[PDB]
Amino acid sequence: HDEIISELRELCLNYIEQDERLSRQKLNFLGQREPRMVLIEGLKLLSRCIEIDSADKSGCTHNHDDKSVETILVESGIVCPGLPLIIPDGYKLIDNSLILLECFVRSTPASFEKKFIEATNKLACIREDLAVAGVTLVPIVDGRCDYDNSFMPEWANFKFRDLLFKLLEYSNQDEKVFEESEYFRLCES
Amino acid sequence: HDEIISELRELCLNYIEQDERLSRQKLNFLGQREPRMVLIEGLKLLSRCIEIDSADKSGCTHNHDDKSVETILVESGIVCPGLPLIIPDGYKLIDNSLILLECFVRSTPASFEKKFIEATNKLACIREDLAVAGVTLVPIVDGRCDYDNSFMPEWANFKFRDLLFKLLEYSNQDEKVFEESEYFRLCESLKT
Ligand SMILES: [Cl-]
Ligand code: NA
């Protein structure tokens, strides 16, 4: 397990592009010593790569600090009442128009379309609410089929995922050990 | 030497404050495996701590991407022709006033005063040039005697320096071992 963590460390430092927007998540990842924490922070790191890549391709700002739509508008001096908690992956307030980005990765066409319609409807629910406040919603849904991005070579991305999986099977092993769970739950009843 | 590198990595990750302006240099430091590179990146890391600390204490923005005075003014919509290439450690354009920061660390009073006068004169040379363009220079020279900064506890700063020194000692002894080799003869006889 320590060898896996060490391998994931070197891939992070040597094969993840030195973009400033990835720095914080790289450090969070590198600070983890516990296998399940390395796994979570590793998944979050790979996700940030994709989100940043999607923001760049969509011509908008990556939602670095996970601000909500309400927070985004407030900072630009726009008052918006009773709007759902939507945290976009990207955004850009340009003139009267608010670009909102939602990206995802789905491996099957069935799950891809289902998620595209969910993401489309999620952004669409705030259209009329924003228009009352004089804001024109520009909703972008970026659907992807793979976990590839411009910050990592294809082999490195694959190897990072292969190592995270090896780390997950060591964690799912502990989840299966919960044959002991049935005993202590029965020790209460 | 691998134990020293490991100790320095631990101090970097656990005892250097998680300020995002330090993130890039922390990663550059953490990526180094060669003792001489760990040392250089370690010194640069300690220097960024001081520069950022100096900018915070001086009430201005740390010059993260090493922009020039001309570049700083241009971004705020100010046209300025003849201007020497001056890259401050910090800056702030507020109103019609341009705050420019220069910080340093000197260990002896003689070197401290000499560097204070150099830094003062460096910023002063663009005073009239900036005024001829409507902007009032607010030049700040922040001289320091030690490496104390708000991003590291005193003990951690001390231990980081103590470990970097042990690395300097090892790395210059490997230079001595290398200087006895024949590759160093091909290295010195390299001019060409
Ligand atoms: Cl200096
Ligand atoms: Na200096």
Residue numbers in the entry:
A (entry chain A): 0 to 188
B (entry chain B): 0 to 191
The authors write:
The endonuclease domain is at the N-terminus of the L protein, a multifunctional protein that includes the RNA-dependent RNA polymerase. The synthesis of mRNA in arenaviruses is a process that is primed by capped nucleotides that are ‘stolen’ from the cellular mRNA by the endonuclease domain in cooperation with other domains of the L protein. The L protein cleaves and snatches the native cellular mRNA cap structure through its endonuclease domain after ∼11 nucleotides, and uses it as a primer sequence for the RdRp domain of the L protein to synthesize the viral mRNA. The catalytic centre of the ENDO resides in the N-terminal part around Asp88 and should contain two Mg2+ (or Mn2+) ions, which are critical for the RNA-cleavage mechanism.
In this study, we decided to assess the impact of a key residue within the catalytic site but a priori not involved in the mechanism. Any change in the hydration shell of proteins owing to changes in their structure affects the thermophoretic movement, which is used to determine binding affinities with high accuracy and sensitivity. The results summarized in Table 2 show that the affinities of ENDO-WT and ENDO-D118A for DPBA (1) are in the same (micromolar) range. ENDO-WT and ENDO-D118A displayed affinities in the low-micromolar range, while no interaction was detected for ENDO-D88A, confirming the earlier results.
